[PDB]
Design a protein around this nucleic acid. Structure first.
Lengths: 38, 140, 99, 140, 190, 70, 120
RNA sequence: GAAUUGCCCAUCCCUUCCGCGGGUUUUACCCAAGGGGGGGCGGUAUUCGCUUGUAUCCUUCUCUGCGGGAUUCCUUGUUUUGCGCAAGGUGAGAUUUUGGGCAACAGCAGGUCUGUGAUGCUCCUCAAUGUUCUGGGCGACACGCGCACUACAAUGUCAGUGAGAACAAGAAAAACGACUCUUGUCGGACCUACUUGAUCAAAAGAGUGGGAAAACCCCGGAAUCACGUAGACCCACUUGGGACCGAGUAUUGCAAUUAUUGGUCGCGCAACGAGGAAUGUCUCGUAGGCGCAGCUCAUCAAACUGUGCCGAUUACGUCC
């Protein structure tokens, strides 16, 4: 497909649960409310 | 409900109505018998009884489980993909019988696509299973 | 018919301030209160590669959300429901319903 | 006179409904005990009832609804919920003396009775498949 | 009553049985259960494996080599048949034949590598009780798989054959030859 | 006796009747371990003789059944 | 005298077996075609193939093999269907194999692209 | 109320307590009759997960938030007093409770400038190579060449083609400024149900119906497994396995060039028979075996991630 927070279209696009945050990796680009505890 | 699993439904509810149904014809015998009944055969449909291990059992499933048909009823269908393309084997079914088996119930022991008994003939005629075998049963 | 209130939120201790506290106002005060126990809590689980390159040990993560759905039931308020749903303002993603 | 108990082993929960009898041969689901298709599991479910009086204390009508794991674990769960139901009946309607007799002999005879055997499962973790056997090695 | 105090496989009785050896009596125990089918936790501690009979242990270690192998319930189906076969062949309770065979197929002495100097050295090392049990079992039921592997026409029957010949001390059995040859090194060198 | 055999023949069946009661344990396997016919219809060969009481059935079951001298 | 006996059907010796369809596959067929077996005038199984022109009536079978379109039996079992230079051909056996292949052995193998060159 | 009320090869007949008379020389064993007591097949009768019917009642089975629950007691052992150790016990559970997750300091000239609006400099800066809903091609090629990882088998311990039975758990899903709707705006790109798809195949066509999910039709099913229904094959490179190869057709898409592939039906009598040296990793619901979903996304999963099912042998020691 294509991405909306980059225009790269490569370095892999997440479209799981209707979000993109893997053309800007979510570890760097957090505050989506996710956490790791386990 | 009543039918199946009250006489041992696996092998002692089958052979007795089978004999009776072949002795005096009732159920469908429509062409399509030769065609694949179960997924990815390398053989013919079966050695003998192409569509005569089927029909009463396909009524039985829908009876006791209430209006399982055409997609739910293949739930108690089979398919393993027992020969495969060297990938992980997966389940399937062949739709061929679905059509014919939803036709069936309008005659013989069931009434309609909402009501699946009459006097429940199969049960009553199966009360003589227990009494005496017709196969020389081990347990009788 | 009977009006129900589902409150869906990411976080506990937002929804808590809604159900317990602000249902007291509707408890027998203007309508009757039938408490069940709230609906099953979904997880949204996502799996993200830690490494930004092909050299690591091929590591991954497990990230999870809680989805709290807090259901309590009432017996047919009409026009009174305006009060009920104006009570919480205390957190974002507090949404309420009327049948 | 009634009691209702449960079995639990793995993800199968059983529910044992007891309804006062002083005869009734114990059964399960829609299929009674002589028609249970796996002979082995049938035998397991028998040892529950058989031992501690074959039909001497086993006279209550006990039927079950067991769902939530494969066939084998359901049979385990069955045994548990049966014996639980007997015990609880003889608690309420009858003195601790009779219960102590029954119970002690259950406990003795290798099931334990009391234990849910509550060893479930593993999580799958990392970067890794099941508990470790990894992918397979890189040289070191 | 009549299954309260009485204990059977389903016709095979545990009154008849006696432990054949006096070396082993705390690693050979009697069955009471009507199938050898397992459902418990069988290991957690160094000896907790000897609280249970040889029957159960054997039936679990009966075969491996999965591909869709049916494991325990399948094994039990073969157990039944093999007991009937052994019964009419010995003209005696099959259980008690198993008791014998496990003891008399076991190696009772061993010899091991334990030396040093760029070289090995062997000494007579006695086999412990639990080991006699375990080793015997494994060898007998290894024989089975190999016998049916491309060969014979027999499915359970090979097990019955082995268990018979083991109890007789006959060197047809896969277990017996091992006891023999090992002891020819371990009582010819100390 | 002879190694390979589909065959239905006079010899086949006549031999059968003598050999079957000889053994103390009869299975479909061992009759084709004499090799006289295949294991396949050696099964059927025992059934319809046991039915006529040349043999004793043991198991309440068929296939992986066994038999004995009557 | 017989009762496992070699059979010439393409003028090629192929040994009998104690099952008819399974042995018949060596003649250039397969099980799923031999659900025609029922209509080949010996639907019985667990039968020798030394039974040719006795209890099998071989000539019957050899008609079905060649054209099953004379019979009423479903022609979904045909080996070739609607060839690129002719209509349907009912079966693949013997020399009739080679004929079709050769035409497309020159054409197919020309193809150029990923999978094309692999087939070439 | 349907339905069963099983006497056509077995569950009107028993159990317990007691008394007497017979067959026994005695013992063991057994026959007959009666009294008391208990219900059993009908005073306990089934199951329908919709007969969604008609009445009544509840929170055992469920669910989520917030709290309970041992390193205590005992063996009087081991413990010089201490720190503690072992076995057994109570108990759901015996010690870092159990499984995961986070993690110090010092660093590596490790990887990443194709993640970024995170960047030094200096290269590409217009016959630009930058850039293009532009077209087509590549990354995927095949002397039969080596290595890494994966999967299928050589079958009798699903065993190979046939049938029937009982039975599982996380998780995914929906909304387009596109139409219609009004004084401020509703339904179509998700699934599954049901029926036609058989007076004649599969692939596959279409209409009705519900859902933003504990609603989706029973929210959960067919593989491992069970099966003697008296199934078939049967110790063979086959009827065990597929990989090549040709013909046909439908489906997906902006575009298919085996893309399609859940499909027909050829070739199988092509390999391969547990496989030299070498080498991998796990002590418990684990290993092993098996299946499903998510993930990526015109379309395809032998991959990856997660849930569930069947579920052991050996060891519980040492430091070579």
């Amino acid at each position: 497909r294509h991405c909306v927070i980059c225009s790269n279209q490569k370095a892999v696009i997440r479209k799981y649960e209707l979000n993109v945050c893997r053309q800007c990796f979510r570890e760097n680009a957090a505050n989506i409310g996710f956490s790791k505890l386990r | 409900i009543r039918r199946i699993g009250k006489k041992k439904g696996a092998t002692m509810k089958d052979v007795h109505p089978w004999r009776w149904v072949k002795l005096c014809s009732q159920h469908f015998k429509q062409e399509g018998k030769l065609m694949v009944p179960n997924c990815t055969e390398i053989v013919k449909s079966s050695h003998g009884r192409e569509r005569a291990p089927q029909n009463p059992d396909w009524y039985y499933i829908r009876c006791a489980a209430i209006l399982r048909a055409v997609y739910m009823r293949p739930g108690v269908g089979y398919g393993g993909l027992s020969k495969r393309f060297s990938n992980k084997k997966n389940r399937g079914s062949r739709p061929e019988i679905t059509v014919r088996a939803s036709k069936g119930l309008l005659h013989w022991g069931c009434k309609s696509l909402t009501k699946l008994g009459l006097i429940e003939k199969c049960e009553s005629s199966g009360h003589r299973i227990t009494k005496n075998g017709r196969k020389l049963a081990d347990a009788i | 018919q009977r009006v129900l209130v589902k409150m869906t939120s990411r976080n506990a201790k937002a929804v808590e301030n809604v159900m317990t506290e602000l249902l007291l106002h509707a408890r027998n005060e203007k309508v009757v209160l039938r408490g069940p126990v709230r609906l099953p809590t979904r997880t949204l689980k996502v799996t993200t590669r830690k490494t930004p390159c092909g050299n690591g040990t091929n590591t991954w993560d497990t990230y999870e959300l809680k989805i709290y759905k807090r259901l309590v039931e009432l017996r047919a308020p009409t026009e009174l429901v305006k009060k009920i749903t104006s009570f919480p303002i205390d957190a974002g993603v507090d949404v309420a319903i009327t049948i | 006179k009634q009691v209702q108990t449960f079995g639990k082993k793995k993800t199968a929960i059983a529910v044992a409904t007891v309804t006062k009898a002083a005869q009734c041969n114990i059964r399960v689901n829609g299929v009674p005990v002589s028609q249970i298709l796996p002979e082995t599991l049938r035998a397991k479910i028998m040892e529950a009832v058989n031992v501690v009086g074959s039909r001497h204390f086993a006279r209550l009508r006990i039927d079950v609804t067991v769902r939530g794991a494969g066939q084998v674990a359901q049979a385990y769960a069955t045994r548990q919920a049966i014996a639980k139901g007997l015990v609880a009946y003889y608690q309420k309607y009858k003195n601790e003396v009779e219960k102590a007799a029954l119970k002690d002999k259950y406990l003795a005879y290798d099931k334990y009775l009391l234990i849910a055997d509550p060893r479930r499962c593993e999580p799958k973790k990392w970067g890794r498949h099941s508990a470790r056997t990894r992918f397979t090695k890189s040289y070191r | 009553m009549s299954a309260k105090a009485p204990k059977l496989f389903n016709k095979w009785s545990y009154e008849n049985l006696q432990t054949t050896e006096i070396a082993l009596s705390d690693h050979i125990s009697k069955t009471a259960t009507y199938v050898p089918h397992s459902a418990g936790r069988w290991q957690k501690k160094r000896f907790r494996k000897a609280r249970i009979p040889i029957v159960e242990r054997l039936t679990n270690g009966l075969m491996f080599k999965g591909r869709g192998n049916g494991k325990k319930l399948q094994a039990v189906r073969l157990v039944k048949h093999t007991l009937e076969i052994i019964h009419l062949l010995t003209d005696q309770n099959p259980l008690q034949v198993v008791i014998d065979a496990v003891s008399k197929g076991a190696p009772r002495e061993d010899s091991t590598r334990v030396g040093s100097g760029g070289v090995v050295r062997r000494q007579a090392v006695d086999v412990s009780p639990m080991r006699r049990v375990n080793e015997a079992i494994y060898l007998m039921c290894k024989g089975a798989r190999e016998a049916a592997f491309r060969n014979l026409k027999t499915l359970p029957e090979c097990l019955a054959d082995e268990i018979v010949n083991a109890s007789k001390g006959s060197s047809n059995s896969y277990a017996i030859k091992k006891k023999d040859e090992v002891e020819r090194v371990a009582k010819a060198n100390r | 006796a002879l190694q390979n055999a589909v065959v239905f023949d006079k010899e086949t069946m006549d031999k059968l009747l003598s050999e079957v009661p000889k053994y103390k344990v009869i299975t479909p396997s061992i009759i084709s371990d004499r090799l006289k016919i295949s294991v396949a219809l050696a099964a059927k060969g025992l059934q319809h003789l046991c039915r006529q009481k040349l043999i004793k059935l043991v198991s309440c079951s068929s296939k992986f059944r066994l038999y004995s001298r009557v | 005298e017989q009762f496992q006996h070699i059979v010439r059907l393409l003028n090629t010796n192929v040994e009998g077996k104690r099952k008819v369809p399974f042995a018949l596959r060596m003649v250039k067929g397969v099980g799923i075609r031999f659900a025609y077996m029922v209509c080949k005038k010996a639907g019985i199984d667990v039968e020798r193939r030394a039974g040719t022109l006795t209890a099998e009536e071989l000539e019957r079978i050899s008609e079905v093999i060649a054209d099953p379109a004379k019979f009423k039996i479903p022609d979904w079992f045909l080996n070739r269907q609607r060839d690129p230079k002719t209509g349907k051909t009912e079966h693949l056996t013997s020399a009739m194999v080679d004929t079709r292949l050769r035409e497309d052995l020159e054409r197919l193998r020309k193809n150029r692209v990923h999978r094309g060159v692999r087939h070439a």
